[PDB]
Amino acid sequence: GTHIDLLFHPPRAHLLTIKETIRKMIKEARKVIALVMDIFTDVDIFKEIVEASTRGVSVYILLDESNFNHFLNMTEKQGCSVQRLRNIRVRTVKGQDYLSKTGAKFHGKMEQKFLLVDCQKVMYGSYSYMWSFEKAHLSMVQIITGQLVESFDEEFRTLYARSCVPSSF
Amino acid sequence: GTHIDLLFHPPRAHLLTIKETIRKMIKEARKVIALVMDIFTDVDIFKEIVEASTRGVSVYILLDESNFNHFLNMTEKQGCSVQRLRNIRVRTVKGQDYLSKTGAKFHGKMEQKFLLVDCQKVMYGSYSYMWSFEKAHLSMVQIITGQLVESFDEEFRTLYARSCVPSSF
């Protein structure tokens, strides 16, 4: 019962860019937006999420811990105190704990990127929400509907359980 | 007309790790292995691929250009002259050409990775073939069969057309 389409950046035969398709998915949200992302500095996509939250959509954002300050820096430059928006919850996720050969205890990264809307549609792939993925890199995503979406919902709830309030907050 | 299973690292409720599943896909190859990868330094996966090529399997490897010398250094340290293996072709892919803030010319990265075997099975996701994805990071892949595999074959041929002989050769 699963359907999958592919999109590329730079775009191939398809009408819309990956970024235009992200904006469409957020505009079409009725209930819930769930986002897992490694680096998030794109102001246009951020503005779309904030607008969704003002019309009553619940928004849950999970960001890689080591890159969180880039998101916080962007929201501040835009004049937005995001921690005051009650309809948006932002939390951070760490990778595995490991020890370096000088004995220090480090953690790695959450290497995971997907957008899950109304428990009904997913965008999954290698595109991160930053300028370099518009101007510099080659990337691809899947647009997913049907039974497989339930597996992405289960993984989002598992990462949300692991996630923490950001230390800056 | 497409079936998809999810695997995680660290593993969840599945018997094999992602790396064990990669080795199994390569051992089961009968005709062709097509790999797209951003960084490749895992000696164990490299040895499985070489073994497949001695079996008569045709192997095509596409690597991100900026990271290529990490792969070359690993093969040399293992005492392998990968140039000499006629059944393996290794080529590099560049991202988009762009101009930086200061006007310097750079190219971006190929942010893509997937393993395509015998034109009938794909592993697609965020796992790279390096130590950090075993011990430090969280990642996920899909095992894909059915009609969508043709779309990955088409994209591999398009990337192969774009790709170049590595400058380091």
Side-chain angles (χ1 to χ4, degrees), chain B residues 40 67-77 80 82-83 168-169:
Chain B
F40 189 171
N67 286 289
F68 173 81
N69 279 318
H70 290 127
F71 172 79
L72 189 52
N73 289 344
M74 175 270 286
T75 70
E76 288 174 339
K77 285 186 184 165
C80 180
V82 69
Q83 299 100 326
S168 302
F169 283 170

Side-chain angles (χ1 to χ4, degrees), chain A residues 28-46 48-149 151-164:
Chain A
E28 289 178 356
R30 297 164 258 108
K31 304 198 265 73
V32 184
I33 293 166
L35 173 61
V36 185
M37 184 52 50
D38 60 342
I39 295 169
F40 187 176
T41 60
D42 186 297
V43 302
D44 302 321
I45 295 166
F46 180 65
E48 290 287 359
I49 290 176
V50 174
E51 179 68 41
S53 79
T54 69
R55 53 181 209 251
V57 179
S58 293
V59 180
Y60 304 96
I61 306 174
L62 298 183
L63 299 179
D64 174 68
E65 189 272 345
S66 73
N67 289 295
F68 177 79
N69 290 331
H70 305 306
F71 169 82
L72 191 54
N73 288 340
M74 177 270 288
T75 58
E76 276 167 4
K77 283 215 271 267
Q78 293 302 109
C80 180
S81 291
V82 63
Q83 58 267 73
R84 307 211 296 252
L85 306 173
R86 300 239 53 111
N87 282 348
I88 306 184
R89 315 317 288 154
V90 186
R91 298 176 68 93
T92 58
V93 181
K94 293 171 164 182
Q96 305 179 63
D97 282 349
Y98 70 99
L99 221 67
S100 98
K101 43 200 161 87
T102 202
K105 192 181 109 196
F106 296 146
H107 64 261
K109 297 184 175 209
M110 178 188 68
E111 297 282 352
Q112 181 63 289
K113 309 175 201 198
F114 67 85
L115 173 65
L116 170 60
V117 178
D118 293 342
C119 305
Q120 270 171 71
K121 187 180 291 182
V122 171
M123 177 183 298
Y124 169 65
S126 64
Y127 182 97
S128 302
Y129 293 1
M130 65 203 292
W131 195 227
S132 59
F133 279 82
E134 286 291 293
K135 300 291 85 165
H137 304 323
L138 265 45
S139 62
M140 182 189 79
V141 298
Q142 291 170 344
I143 309 296
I144 306 171
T145 54
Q147 191 76 354
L148 185 60
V149 172
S151 297
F152 281 86
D153 185 56
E154 184 180 34
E155 182 66 8
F156 188 81
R157 288 187 259 107
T158 302
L159 293 171
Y160 203 86
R162 185 186 178 91
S163 77
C164 295

